[PDB]
């Protein structure tokens, strides 16, 4: 048809890889995700047309709010006797006319409650309507209390007054398309019996430019010794050799894999590709017969002479190292045995000081290892451990994955094993535990107990868990796509999770599949979409253009070749009049190339400026500023500036402002991003230079509260000093805590009001010096001082209560090719920062120290 056809077009431009090349991979695994994928698209679509226009309009527009309702103390201490002042603006006449209605109202009100007083204020002199943010397109569409929408418990952090626009739920439906997911062209033996040893013949190899080393694996660790072939000159790379392992066939867990790789001697053993595969298929067969695997190469920095936390599956591009292996082929098809067999099998196969002891082991942290003593000792009390649900990660780590038995009874305490909080669910989801019981419990713990708040703000670590997912169809998958198909504001961020990595090919196939299945339920955003791409394809474009032909030129000539260039209405066309990728509920209209210019700096990074075309842009901002980056990797930033606002929200919801600033910053693709520029703010080094004595003259620290003072004037002055210093001590903390890169007088920013933060952070995990300046503002012997280290300390103490989350966060995003975040040895530099193996007091002695120096 014709519908299907520009689909499709449009399509493989969002995904950058046209959708016929999936359906000419003849790949079974492939075919069936594409079609059995299409149910969630179904469940989401029909849940978006299930309650008429309001459904959709909360799929495009959902509430941005906090999880809990319940305000922290402090924060509602900033209210007028618990209630909060709001302004209404409604827009009248054919010429626009804005008025404006101010009310005092509970903060606990429900929009309609707000509407019902705006159209009572405004009478003195029905339910049709809807509240919508000034200056861009979020709306109140639910009943939740006013306070806990993020705009408004925002408005009430920072002193700002909340502007809301009164709209007409009518003229809001009207801008909804009559949506229409059509769909696609594409839809329309044995068990455990076999009792024997498992071996494989590596046949021989091709494109190889030495022996081969192999073995089975469970997640990280392996179920037997691995099993190094014959050496064979790399001539003739013809082993035809048998392997025999330390495993019997039934024995195999449900994820097993192999893992292999080719190695070669001077002595100084090298690997040279590496590969794994999946010993059971998508459809539970044990695979067997011939197979050829085509290898992947090496990454920087392998210790060992195998990958097995590599991803499973053959290169895409055929032209490399392939092995050909034999599996044995027995009586039948084996597949591995369903639920019933287990639960059969494993029904046929105490102290109070010991009670404790679980408990505290259970208190303990991710990476602290368990001893082959304690793993007995939880696995012999394995049934009380269901009394403690958050040790089952522990439990889960002491079971010897090699024994059909032990995993039979494992199952069975999961099939009933009580659910835990996603926090803790999380865990059960990185490489250490790709067992599909046990994602499976995960995946269940987060559709039951995570709000699409806490979905958004971890969206980042589930989409790259993902790729430790054993098949394509899985429930973890299913679970995201489904929130990113009823959700627009996660469907974003998912959508631009997984096209920033389309240029991996180890996981193209993956996210490639997901990615056309979600364009083609996610409705008329697509092209929205396909308008970001182009403008990013454009900008990408002019970026490498100037880092290349133009590279050495002065400033004002590629500033000249820039304005060239961003003219060509071919490219105004492109970078005019689209959402944010940052934020897509920012429009930007019309490009203000007089504001736009090269950073200088490093890597060229373009600094781009766009007129509001909101109705009432004036009353948040008239202009969005972008850095858009092409050059050196932003994932490090955003797994960063997460952190940075998790630890405000504790903070916040423990009860110190410390207020933070995690500006927003997305990686789109290979090193290509976008930077949030906070409006009214500037470097330290640019409060030295421009505050410097003369032209030629040294550039004094004492100058900055100086500054400060000359921006804040009258009883602004303390609201300025205590924003600074609170903001400090809190990056302080932070910085000392994630070990940021150096720090300098440009590292750091602070704004107009006092507010300071950090911005481009290079090298984590691998002393803020608090240059005078910030002690002179702060102000070394004054109550100023003495609260600055009790802020600190707290602050410490608070994190030190959420090791365990924090250290999850980075087990999940190992599996992210980041540099400085490759093995679990860089993230016990976090265990190390914040004491996890001392006390509460030690560690609180272990801060006072190292701040002291
Ligand atoms: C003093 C005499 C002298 O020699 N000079 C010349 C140099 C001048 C100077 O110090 N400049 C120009 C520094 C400066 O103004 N900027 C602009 C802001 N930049 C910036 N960088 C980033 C960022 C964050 N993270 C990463 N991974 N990369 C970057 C980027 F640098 F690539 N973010 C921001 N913002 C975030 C907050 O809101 C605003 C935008 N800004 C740094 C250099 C002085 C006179």
Same mark, same amino acid.
Request: charged share 30%; with cysteine.
């Given at each position: 048809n014709r519908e299907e056809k520009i689909l499709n077009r449009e399509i493989g431009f969002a995904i950058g890889m046209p959708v016929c090349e999936f359906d000419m991979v003849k790949d079974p695994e492939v075919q069936d995700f594409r079609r059995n994928i299409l149910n969630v698209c179904k469940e989401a679509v029909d849940l978006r047309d299930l309650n008429s226009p309001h459904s959709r309009a909360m799929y495009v527009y959902p509430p941005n709010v906090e999880s809990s309702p319940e305000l922290p103390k402090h924060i509602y201490n900033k209210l007028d006797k618990g209630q909060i002042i709001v302004v209404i603006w409604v827009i009248v006449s054919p010429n626009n006319d804005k008025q404006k209605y101010t009310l005092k109202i509970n903060?606990?009100?429900?929009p309609e409650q707000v509407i019902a007083e705006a159209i009572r204020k405004k009478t003195?002199?029905?339910?049709?309507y809807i509240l919508k943010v000034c200056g861009?397109?979020? %709306?109140? $569409?639910?009943? %939740?209390? $006013?306070?806990? %929408?993020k705009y408004i418990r925002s408005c009430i952090m920072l002193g700002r007054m909340p502007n809301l626009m009164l709209m007409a739920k009518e003229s809001l439906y009207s801008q909804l398309p009559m949506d229409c997911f059509t769909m696609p062209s594409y839809s329309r033996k044995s068990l455990w019996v076999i009792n024997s040893a498992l071996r494989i013949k590596i046949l021989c190899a091709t494109y190889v430019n030495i022996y081969v080393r192999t073995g089975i694996y469970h997640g990280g660790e392996p179920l037997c010794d691995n099993v190094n072939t014959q050496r064979v000159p790399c001539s003739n790379p013809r082993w035809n050799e048998w392997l025999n392992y330390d495993i019997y066939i039934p024995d195999l867990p449900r994820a097993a894999r192999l893992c292999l790789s080719i190695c070669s001697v001077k002595e100084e053993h090298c690997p040279l590709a590496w590969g794994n595969i999946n010993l059971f298929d998508y459809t539970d067969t044990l695979v067997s017969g011939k197979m050829a695997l085509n290898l992947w190469p090496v990454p920087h920095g392998l210790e060992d002479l195998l990958n097995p936390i590599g991803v499973t599956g053959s290169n895409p591009n055929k032209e490399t190292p392939c092995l050909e292996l034999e599996f044995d082929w027995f009586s039948s098809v084996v597949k591995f045995p369903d639920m019933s067999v287990i639960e059969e099998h494993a029904n046929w196969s105490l102290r109070e000081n010991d009670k404790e002891q679980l408990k505290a082991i259970s208190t303990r942290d991710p990476l602290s290892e368990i001893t082959e003593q304690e793993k007995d000792f939880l696995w012999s009390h394995r049934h009380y451990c269901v009394t403690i649900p958050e040790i089952l990660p522990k439990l889960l780590l002491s079971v010897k994955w090699n024994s059909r038995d032990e995993v039979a009874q494992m199952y069975c305490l999961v099939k009933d094993w009580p659910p835990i909080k996603p926090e803790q669910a999380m865990e059960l989801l990185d490489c250490n535990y790709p067992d599909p019981m046990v994602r499976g419990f995960a995946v269940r713990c987060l559709e039951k107990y995570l709000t699409d708040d806490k979905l958004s703000q971890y969206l980042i670590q589930l989409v790259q868990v993902?790729?430790?997912?054993?098949?394509?169809?899985?429930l973890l998958v299913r679970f995201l796509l489904k929130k990113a198909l009823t959700n627009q504001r996660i469907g974003h961020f998912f959508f631009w999770h997984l096209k920033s990595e389309m240029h991996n090919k180890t996981v193209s196939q993956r996210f490639g599949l997901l990615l056309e299945s979600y364009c083609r339920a996610c409705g008329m955003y697509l092209k929205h979409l396909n308008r970001q791409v182009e403008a990013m394809e454009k900008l990408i474009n002019l970026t490498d253009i100037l880092k290349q032909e133009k590279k050495d030129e002065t400033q004002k000539v590629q500033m000249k070749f820039l304005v060239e260039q961003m003219r060509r209405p071919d490219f105004m066309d492109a970078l005019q009049g689209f959402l944010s990728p940052l934020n897509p509920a920012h429009q930007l209209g019309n490009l203000r190339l007089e504001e736009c210019r090269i950073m200088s700096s490093a890597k060229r990074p373009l600094w781009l400026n766009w007129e509001n075309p909101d109705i009432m842009s004036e009353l948040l901002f008239q202009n969005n500023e972008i850095i858009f980056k092409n050059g050196d990797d932003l994932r490090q930033d955003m797994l960063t500036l997460q952190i940075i606002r998790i630890m405000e929200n504790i903070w916040q919801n423990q009860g110190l402002d410390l207020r933070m600033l995690p500006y927003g910053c997305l990686s789109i693709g290979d090193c290509v991003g976008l930077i949030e520029v906070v409006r009214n703010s500037h470097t330290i080094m640019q409060i030295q230079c421009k505050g410097g004595?003369?032209?030629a003259l040294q550039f004094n620290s004492h100058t900055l509260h100086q500054w400060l003072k000359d921006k804040n004037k009258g009883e602004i002055y303390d609201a300025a000093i205590d924003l600074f210093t609170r903001s400090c001590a809190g990056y302080c903390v932070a910085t000392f805590i994630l070990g940021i890169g150096d720090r300098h007088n440009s590292n750091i920013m602070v704004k107009d009001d006092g507010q300071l933060f950090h911005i481009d952070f290079g090298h984590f995990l691998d002393p803020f010096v608090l240059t005078q300046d910030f002690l002179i503002v702060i102000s070394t012997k004054t109550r100023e001082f003495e609260r600055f280290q009790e802020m600190c300390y707290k602050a410490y103490l608070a994190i030190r209560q959420h090791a365990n989350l924090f250290i999850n966060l980075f087990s999940m995003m190992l599996?992210?090719?980041?540099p400085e975040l490759q093995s679990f040895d860089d993230i016990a530099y976090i265990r190390k920062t914040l004491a996890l193996d001392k006390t509460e007091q030690e560690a609180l002695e272990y801060f006072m120290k190292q701040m002291n120096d």
């Open positions: 903060h606990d009100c429900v003195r002199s029905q339910g049709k861009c397109d979020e %709306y109140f $569409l639910e009943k %939740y209390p $006013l306070s806990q %929408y993902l790729k430790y997912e054993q098949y394509l169809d899985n004595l003369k032209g599996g992210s090719g980041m």
